Amino acid sequence: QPVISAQEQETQIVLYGKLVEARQKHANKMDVPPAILATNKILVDMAKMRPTTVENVKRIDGVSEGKAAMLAPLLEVIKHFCQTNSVQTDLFSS
Numbered sequence: 001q002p003v004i005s006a007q008e009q010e011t012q013i014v015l016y017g018k019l020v021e022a023r024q025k026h027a028n029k030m031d032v033p034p035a036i037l038a039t040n041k042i043l044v045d046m047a048k049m050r051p052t053t054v055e056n057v058k059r060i061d062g063v064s065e066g067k068a069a070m071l072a073p074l075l076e077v078i079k080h081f082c083q084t085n086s087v088q089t090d091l092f093s094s
Ligand SMILES: [Cl-]
Pocket: 013, 014, 015, 016, 017, 018
C-alpha cells in the first residue's frame, strides 16, 4: 500500500518547511508575494522531486524558465539539505 519509506515521508515534510521559509525570504527580497514566487503546490513538488538545477525545476508543473531563475535560492536550499542529510535528489525519469 505505501510507496515511499517512513524516512522519505519525514524528509519531505522537513524540506517543505525549509522551502516555505526560503520562499518567504526571497519573495520579500524580490518584492513579490510568496505565492507569486511559488505556490504551496509547487513547493510540495519540489520537496518530493528535489530538483537541484534550473533544467530539472523546469520539469515541475507551473515552473517556467524565467520562474526557474527566480527559484534559484530554493534549489540551493534543496541541494545543501540533501547533502547534509543523505538523501537522493532530482527524482526525475531523466
Ligand atoms: Cl517542516
